[PDB]
Amino acid sequence: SALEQFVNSVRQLSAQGQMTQLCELINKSGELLAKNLSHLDTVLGALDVQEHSLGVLAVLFVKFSMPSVPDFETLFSQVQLFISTCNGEHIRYATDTFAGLCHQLTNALVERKQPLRGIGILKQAIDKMQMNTNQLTSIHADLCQLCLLAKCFKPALPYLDVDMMDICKENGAYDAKHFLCYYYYGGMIYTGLKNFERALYFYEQAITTPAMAVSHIMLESYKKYILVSLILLGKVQQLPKYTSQIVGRFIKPLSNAYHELAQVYSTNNPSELRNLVNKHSETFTRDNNMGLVKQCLSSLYKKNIQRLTKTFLTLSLQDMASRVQLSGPQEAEKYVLHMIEDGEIFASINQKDGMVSFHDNPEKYNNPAMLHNIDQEMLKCIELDERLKAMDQEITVNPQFVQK
Amino acid sequence: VVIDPTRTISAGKVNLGAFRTYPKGYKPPDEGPSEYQTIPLNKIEDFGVHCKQYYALEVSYFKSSLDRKLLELLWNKYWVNTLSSSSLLTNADYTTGQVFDLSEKLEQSEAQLGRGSEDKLAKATRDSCKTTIEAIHGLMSQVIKDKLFNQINI
Amino acid sequence: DNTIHGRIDQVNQLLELDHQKRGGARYTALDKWTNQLNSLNQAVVSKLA
Amino acid sequence: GLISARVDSHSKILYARDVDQRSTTFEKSLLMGKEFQRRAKAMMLRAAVLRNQIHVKSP
Amino acid sequence: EHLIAQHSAIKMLHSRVKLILEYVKASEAGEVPFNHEILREAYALCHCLPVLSTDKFKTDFYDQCNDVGLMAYLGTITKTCNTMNQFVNKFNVLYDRQ
Amino acid sequence: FSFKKLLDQCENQELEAPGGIATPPVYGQLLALYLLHNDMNNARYLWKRIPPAIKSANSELGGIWSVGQRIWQRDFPGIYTTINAHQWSETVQPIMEALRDATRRRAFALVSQAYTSIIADDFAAFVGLPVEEAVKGILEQGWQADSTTRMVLPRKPNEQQLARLTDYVAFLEN
């Protein structure tokens, strides 16, 4: 039996070194035509935990159609058990079949329309594949896609709050698709959680990927970057200097309605903004970014009210709800109350005279709290510089960086 | 002999240098240590041009027996001024001038980076480090004074 | 004509003369340093490509 | 333009506005520091992707 | 160096205050003739602490601390910019094909 | 304290799940805990991903989402008149009581910080209690009030220092 020979060879190679030959043997596939792989799977999990079986599991999953009989539940339980108990850096010797199996599992879950069983799977399938917590793997894209298809945005926050600094080569593969998918779905998650300060950063990171062809991901990432910039700031932030020249010749003309919206969001006219919004309603709902343009429309009024603080000290409510076109002293009062509650503005309301007083005098910088804030900023900068020097010395002692 | 009464106060150590020049037409054979000295932009050309025509002697100080006895007797009453110094207030115009000079040097370094003596960014960084270290020393002295005197609530 | 250094308070019918001087040179120097640091950081980042 | 003042439309009085330098410089310096840190992180990621040779191909 | 100077002066202060505390404790327990002027002066000295615990002083002290903190922040940013420039130069030399 | 741990436990139980679907009691507890902590986005997304079968089977989720919608609209009278419309048995009652107390405290803080002259009826509507006892109880808190105009006047309310400096100096000098 050839399968028995393969299992025996795996047993001898395990707990004996010769990892290059072990990987070569596990890459020697195509002879797994027999469909009785279950018993050969359940013989070596106890010995030397699970540095193996990845091969058999990927072969069980690659079928692309009707994979593992009505025992798909048993296959899923086998996969989750292997991912949980495999442990060790041993599997890192073959860290491309791991990503492939995770991709197959994610695609199967998406097709089955239960994208919540896997959120816990490609969360333990990350800490045992990445070298350190600052390394981007191709499973980050899968986890973001799963926790975005299922509306569970909290599990991905620990894996989005980190600043990626090394990218796993994954023994070949790892095209730009995974990079764009991660840095776009993270931005989508942050936008859903109303963190525009970092949604903008993620969208910019997706946009500035070195490219020479138009990708569907970068189009509807430039489009969302424009809107998130219009919401967070008052203007479309200028893209970095090292952005690829492709975006300035095709992406910009392809995304035109958003550029008209940005241009109209420069002369403060809520009526004109609403007119353009409901004129291009078909486009804005076909691109699926509807409910963000409404956020831009709602933010225009708040921007105008904030601008009212740069000239005025005390303004009547009825008079104020005539420059921002809010059509009502009660509506203006509720807008001011919401803005004060959210902390966007510094003002007080007087109902006896119906007048809003703008203070705009938050604080003086003479507090231990401000001292602590500056201390934290300095600590972050010090850590940044230390990492810069640490990664500089590696280039310094590089033999290739001795001839030149 | 050249003295720096402002840098003396700022750094807490005397800035005194004794120099002697070379005869006309004499070319000294290398042997240039050339320790770094911060010098403003408006006075850097003269220092660069006239730098190999003089050398710095090694300076040491001495005192007599009565002077030593009197100084060791005087310290017993002079230790107060060390604990009541407050060096962060007496030197503020100097720090402002240093920051102005450093900003100008940073502008020149950025211009060199944009364009196409060597690595002015390193010199600007050293100047900024010196100024900031002096400021932090001045602050930590006051922190020590506060810990000593203001916290011993009866 | 810049012969009297002060400003008139019309509501209370008085005039207040500026006699207090603060150390604005330090803050002007800090502003210049911040602007130069911003420009230098932008250039250094844009160098890599 | 050149007028630095704030209107008071209750009593209809224009008050001159004097800006304190200390708070303004503190605010601008902190903003510049935040921008610098964000740019440094972004370019660190850019260096990582450039070293790893990630780019979009025609197919 | 800075801390060493401050240390010498604080050491002198400690010596003196400890000798005074000893005299006072020795006088209280009973080892030396009871002196009233010295004890009254010791009480007056003990009543002089803390020195300047007022709100205006606290505000001025925190002003100074925050000013030095901002200067240190700017210096740290400058040093990090220099290190960044060196790293960018080395990366450009290594990973570029000319 | 007693609610943060419960929220974490419910989140973990939902995440593990017997196949993605959690029991309706856990769903209700999680939704009400999200409402309590003012995590409006999390509650909004939690309601969106609840299966329609669970929505139809249990009717208390409808009332819980009614409370959530009243909180989302920032309509305090709606919150107070919708909280006191249904009940359960010890599963959501303590946390709904805590939510009511939190809403009261938040309304008090908001009125104190964003008002200098508020009509007594509006203040009573904001706080939740009817007018008489609220106007009676503001004075004992120090808030000025006056009759015949009912215009309440809210009133607006280490040895390691050397270590950090030494660290900064050691970094700068290197």
UniProtKB/Swiss-Prot annotation, chain B:
<comment type="function">
    <text>Probable protease subunit of the COP9 signalosome complex (CSN), a complex involved in various cellular and developmental processes. The CSN complex is an essential regulator of the ubiquitin (Ubl) conjugation pathway by mediating the deneddylation of the cullin subunits of the SCF-type E3 ligase complexes, leading to decrease the Ubl ligase activity of SCF-type complexes such as SCF, CSA or DDB2. The complex is also involved in phosphorylation of p53/TP53, c-jun/JUN, IkappaBalpha/NFKBIA, ITPK1 and IRF8, possibly via its association with CK2 and PKD kinases.</text>
</comment>
<comment type="similarity">
    <text>Belongs to the peptidase M67A family. CSN5 subfamily.</text>
</comment>
<protein>
    <recommendedName>
        <fullName>COP9 signalosome complex subunit 5</fullName>
    </recommendedName>
</protein>
<comment type="subunit">
    <text>Component of the CSN complex, composed of COPS1/GPS1, COPS2, COPS3, COPS4, COPS5, COPS6, COPS7 (COPS7A or COPS7B), COPS8 and COPS9 isoform 1. In the complex, it probably interacts directly with COPS1, COPS2, COPS4, COPS6 and COPS7 (COPS7A or COPS7B) and COPS9 isoform 1. Interacts with COPS9 isoform 2. The CSN complex interacts with the BRISC complex. Also exists as monomeric form. Interacts with TP53, MIF, JUN, UCHL1, NCOA1, HIF1A, CDKN1B, BCL3, GFER, PGR, LHCGR, SMAD4, SMAD7, ID1, ID3, ITGB2 and TOP2A. Part of a complex consisting of RANBP9, Ran, DYRK1B and COPS5. Interacts with IFIT3.</text>
</comment>
From Swiss-Prot, chain D:
<comment type="similarity">
    <text>Belongs to the CSN1 family.</text>
</comment>
<feature type="modified residue" description="Phosphoserine">
    <location>
        <position position="58"/>
    </location>
</feature>
<comment type="subunit">
    <text>Component of the CSN complex, composed of COPS1/GPS1, COPS2, COPS3, COPS4, COPS5, COPS6, COPS7 (COPS7A or COPS7B), COPS8 and COPS9 isoform 1. In the complex, it probably interacts directly with COPS2, COPS3, COPS4 and COPS5. Interacts directly with inositol kinase ITPK1. Interacts with CAPN8. Interacts with USP48. Interacts with ASB4; this interaction negatively regulates GPS1.</text>
</comment>
<protein>
    <recommendedName>
        <fullName>COP9 signalosome complex subunit 1</fullName>
    </recommendedName>
</protein>
<comment type="function">
    <text>Essential component of the COP9 signalosome complex (CSN), a complex involved in various cellular and developmental processes. The CSN complex is an essential regulator of the ubiquitin (Ubl) conjugation pathway by mediating the deneddylation of the cullin subunits of SCF-type E3 ligase complexes, leading to decrease the Ubl ligase activity of SCF-type complexes such as SCF, CSA or DDB2. The complex is also involved in phosphorylation of p53/TP53, c-jun/JUN, IkappaBalpha/NFKBIA, ITPK1 and IRF8/ICSBP, possibly via its association with CK2 and PKD kinases.</text>
</comment>
UniProtKB/Swiss-Prot annotation, chain E:
<comment type="similarity">
    <text>Belongs to the peptidase M67A family. CSN6 subfamily.</text>
</comment>
<protein>
    <recommendedName>
        <fullName>COP9 signalosome complex subunit 6</fullName>
    </recommendedName>
</protein>
<comment type="function">
    <text>Component of the COP9 signalosome complex (CSN), a complex involved in various cellular and developmental processes. The CSN complex is an essential regulator of the ubiquitin (Ubl) conjugation pathway by mediating the deneddylation of the cullin subunits of SCF-type E3 ligase complexes, leading to decrease the Ubl ligase activity of SCF-type complexes such as SCF, CSA or DDB2. The complex is also involved in phosphorylation of p53/TP53, c-jun/JUN, IkappaBalpha/NFKBIA, ITPK1 and IRF8, possibly via its association with CK2 and PKD kinases.</text>
</comment>
<comment type="subunit">
    <text>(Microbial infection) Interacts with the HIV-1 protein Vpr.</text>
</comment>
<feature type="region of interest" description="Interaction with Vpr">
    <location>
        <begin position="1"/>
        <end position="98"/>
    </location>
</feature>
<comment type="subunit">
    <text>Component of the CSN complex, composed of COPS1/GPS1, COPS2, COPS3, COPS4, COPS5, COPS6, COPS7 (COPS7A or COPS7B), COPS8 and COPS9 isoform 1. In the complex, it probably interacts directly with COPS2, COPS4, COPS5, COPS7 (COPS7A or COPS7B) and COPS9 isoform 1. Interacts with the translation initiation factor EIF3S6. Interacts weakly with RBX1. Directly interacts with COP1 and 14-3-3 protein sigma/SFN. Interacts with ERCC6.</text>
</comment>
Curated annotation (Swiss-Prot), chain F:
<protein>
    <recommendedName>
        <fullName>COP9 signalosome complex subunit 8</fullName>
    </recommendedName>
</protein>
<feature type="domain" description="PCI">
    <location>
        <begin position="1"/>
        <end position="157"/>
    </location>
</feature>
<dbReference type="GO" id="GO:2000434">
    <property type="term" value="P:regulation of protein neddylation"/>
</dbReference>
<dbReference type="GO" id="GO:0005634">
    <property type="term" value="C:nucleus"/>
</dbReference>
<dbReference type="Pfam" id="PF10075">
    <property type="entry name" value="CSN8_PSD8_EIF3K"/>
</dbReference>
<dbReference type="GO" id="GO:0008285">
    <property type="term" value="P:negative regulation of cell population proliferation"/>
</dbReference>
<dbReference type="GO" id="GO:0008180">
    <property type="term" value="C:COP9 signalosome"/>
</dbReference>
<dbReference type="GO" id="GO:0048471">
    <property type="term" value="C:perinuclear region of cytoplasm"/>
</dbReference>
<keyword id="KW-0597">Phosphoprotein</keyword>
<dbReference type="GO" id="GO:0010387">
    <property type="term" value="P:COP9 signalosome assembly"/>
</dbReference>
<dbReference type="GO" id="GO:0000338">
    <property type="term" value="P:protein deneddylation"/>
</dbReference>
<dbReference type="GO" id="GO:0005737">
    <property type="term" value="C:cytoplasm"/>
</dbReference>
